[model samples]
Target chain A: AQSVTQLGSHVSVSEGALVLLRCNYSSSVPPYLFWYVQYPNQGLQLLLKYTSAATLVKGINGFEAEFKKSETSFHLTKPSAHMSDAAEYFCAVSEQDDKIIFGKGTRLHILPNIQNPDPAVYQLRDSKSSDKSVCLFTDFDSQTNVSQSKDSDVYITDKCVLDMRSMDFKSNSAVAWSNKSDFACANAFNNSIIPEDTFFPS
Target chain B: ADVTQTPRNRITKTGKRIMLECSQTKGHDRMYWYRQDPGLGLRLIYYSFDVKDINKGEISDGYSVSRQAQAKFSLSLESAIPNQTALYFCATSDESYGYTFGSGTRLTVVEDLNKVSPPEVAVFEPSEAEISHTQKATLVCLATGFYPDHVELSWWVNGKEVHSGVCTDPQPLKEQPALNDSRYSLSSRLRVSATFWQNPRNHFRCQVQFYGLSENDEWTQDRAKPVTQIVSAEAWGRAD
Candidate 1:
């Protein structure tokens, strides 16, 4: 039971396709493995880290992760994925003797493209009310490109920092609407729009 | 906890002069620059501690930042225009890893002449506002509209910086001469209640300071530093 598993809470790709996000760490063999990216309200960005020396680690904009050690796992990959690569991803595990455990966030779904058009409808804003409806969603399109990628998923943190101050949302491809100020966020239909990764409400 | 940035995109024109480069493979003393404009999203224009201290944000008027090297941190938009285009981000913070953003720099200032926008800091706590145990809660540190108005506002608890008894007494400054928008407003009030309430793990902050251009625009009489907002008291139930 001494564990860490972050298989997937959500992950759907196709902007150029190829992105797998998984994790597994049961306290047995865990030296270090990290992958963090949270852009929407900001805070949490270190898209790559895998120290056992290196099973393979390369990150920042292009993103990559791999540390297997006979399946203790550390899965995270991105060969093409981009729409700004959506957002929200975390898979951490550490063992030099202290603390560095996290795994319960994966929302890198940047689908959109059946040719295009008709893929947009984001609303999450009751964290304090920017008004539209409260929590809504619709930004999809991912067909599948699994060459094979492994997992362990299950980590999602948000309940306060005041839910990150009402979150305003920031990606999916941009969406803005202001009555004088919610501070506008509209990319509307082509920044890709999924924005608010999680405060849990929406 | 490594950070890096460089020519992800830049176009430049009006008055010409642009520099957006940030690099920190990990020696981070602290660094940050945020800009995202669609409707106005991530705005914390400039920050540093590696260069010793170079703060400016709340729209960070006309922009100017430097940190020759500590792994390097730079952002120069001293003369460019076109509403300063948009999409400029870079991050690195210290106090045991807390902010790490980068993968941005999509500036495209073709020409908007000379646009000055710096002052849109926020921190409000009103609807359903309650501090319990007896009642007493006031926290508002908003500083709208920015220009050459000469700004300064401060308060912090749990991170030091606080005077006399909590805060309250720096209010007047609310210009709204409207035309297209004159820009000027101010506020400061932090008087948490219930005796700091049995150690609810307090955290409160609101800071602001001004004097627009510096660096490339160099319009300085010396002024720049203060842009912060923290608010926690168990999110304000104080402990319950």
Candidate 2:
């Protein structure tokens, strides 16, 4: 029986840092190795593949994977991590039978650079408290300012604004406040929740 | 362009024969059938290289596959049982491109209690000898005497389902032939922090959901009463 294992379930890397997702397989015969990436709500897209032709295979989005026969490893790596590179990755293997086996999957997380942080604005809408408003600064150390509006109230926290009055205050309820109407909403819900301790730094 | 599977959903009585059809427009040389189960993950049942050339996979017992045309493949279950009920996927692969998978076919096999036997579940406390060196404690859940071998096990820690650190057997192990029993047995292990296991406030429970037909003609769903075993703080202390 053939099996594949992904060493890590989650890997965190700072922006522009090298990203490595380890994958190892056990097969009786020579096998094919492949790396696939799945963005949120999207189907899986093949990142790279390693047949018997080459040991080092380069994929789209500056990602690459190497097939190490001696170590029974086919690890995927990228020189620089981009915010878009944050997605779920799967390592798969198949032998002569062409029966592909997949790993449990590893989620890549791109941590923002603290020195030059990206501008992030969160919008919280409440159906019940339509008269109150709150706006939170991008900086965590800054004080949260609660503002009132005729249409809605904004409740702000250090990391994000939460509308306490909104009964459906799920992570998805928070949307990105963008300048242009065409700007897509960032899926902040899928990202790991920042620990409360991080918000109150000593 | 894409792989397609017909009959998106299928329901058949146990011991009945059924065929699953798959077709691909990409004209790929390889086609595969894989079954996805809860804890067992994706298991390959069969694959075909060319017309009339097929190979059995790891979990191909009681199942057969055929490829009559370059773009068409079929998987047949001679004696379908509740254990064979799962989401089946058909995939085509080319050397250049990786693979294209079909949407999938959900197969449900129904058999009443007369032919199906529910599992006997037991959750064993972590032994002191096993946790002496490691910071994690392992709790084992054993399910045995289950007919059809189609059962799902879940771990609950203090009433919340726990997904991480749980490992289950890929497939049920059939009982020895000497016993003259066709039943199967399997085990699942749950790893928890040793410190958490030491706390008397925490409790661990393992639930086994058997898939078979209920007294009614309808298929037994996940809502079927599960055979469960709870390892409480008192049980943990008794292990020592």
Candidate 3:
């Protein structure tokens, strides 16, 4: 009669912040602890496993988990969170009989740093655009507005809002935007307009 | 693209032999077969490293596995029973890339079914330590002495069904020393936040639905009347 309980069903953390996914198990004998990550539409990938070799187990993609016998816990942790780390995580405990029981699952959501206080203008361009013209925009207004400038291919007024609904853009277009200042451009594409500082191409 | 399984769906009668086939294009050293059933998440049945290096997994009773080549693996049930109806998945794994699973095979074992035995359901109150430690209460539901292990357990708060925070054993626990007249038992747990469990107005109920065969060899389901349990003041006082 072994069981595992994941403390949180969904855990939200900012990019590069500490991530901790809690797991507790009930077993009479010493059990094996494993953390698995499942990307969207993908099979479960083993992150790390603890089986008396080491209490602190390091896994791929900067993930790690520790087995604490006293607390009956095997919590997964990582110092920094990558945007690719946002996926469903499962905590499992294997009993002496080799029966592995898995927790329902904890979805790790990496929240991007949207609070970019810097006053800088960004130039965005559709990667598929034949002309190398860049669309200039600023983060002045909170609302997302779209308008075309005479000199530029596209003029986006306040906010880096790539509103496809307001503008007539080709379907499945990839928009790569970058700031002229020291800030780097976070590529935004694939029908999702996330107001984040970092982006990974879908 | 390496692992492939055939026969997406299979229906067979009781006491019949059945085989599931799996092949891998990738030269992985490990291959596995797992069965998924309602209430039981997934249970490993067998795995192989090479042609002769095969190992039995957690639930390998009444089943045999073969790996005659590095790219092929097969699982066979000598005598299929209604309880063996489940979704079977084939997987191939390497050390670096973890595992790649094939589209599962849905197995349906019917005909010559066992007599129906409805479950006896009971709900237990949360323990004091369960409430005090995490500010969350876990209520357990036990369904026992049911034949033809096709039963579903659900939790209800007040009158509405609660979808989340519910956990159940993937497979029923079989009673020992009685293989011919085997009765199965299972337990489901419902976890709720302390704010919801502490309120006297919030009543909890556990329901069990058992699917069995009728006298005319037709499939029928029997739902047991759920027993509702309210957190009494005495139970809350014990936690303090």
Return the top candidate by DockQ. 1
Q: Residue A71 in model 3: shift from native, Å? A: 1.0
In order, the first chain's TM-score in every candidate is 0.27, 0.62, 0.58
Every model's TM-score: 0.31, 0.46, 0.39
lDDT of each: 0.52, 0.61, 0.60
Q: What is each candidate's DockQ, to 2 decimals?
A: 0.04, 0.03, 0.02
Ordering by TM-score:
2, 3, 1
Per-residue CA lDDT of candidate 3, range B35-133, in tens? 865334457798887787988877999899889888999999999987888878888867533567887776767654434466766555553443554
- Enumerate clash totals for all models, in the order shown: 24, 6, 2
Native contacts recovered, each model = 0.02, 0.05, 0.02
Task: Give the per-residue lDDT of model 1 (tens digit) for B17-84.
Answer: 78888897776777778776543335567677766778665677887888887778898888887778
Cα deviation in Å at residue A78, candidate 3? 1.0
Give candidate 2 regions above 4 Å deviation: A1-3, A27-31, A40-43, A97-99, A111-202, B7-20, B26-29, B36-41, B61-68, B76-87, B94-98, B103-240
Candidate 2 structure lDDT: 0.61
Off by over 4 Å in 3: A116-202, B1-20, B24-32, B35-88, B92-240
Candidates 2 and 3 compared: the better one by DockQ is 2
Report how far off residue A23 is in candidate 2 (Å): 1.6
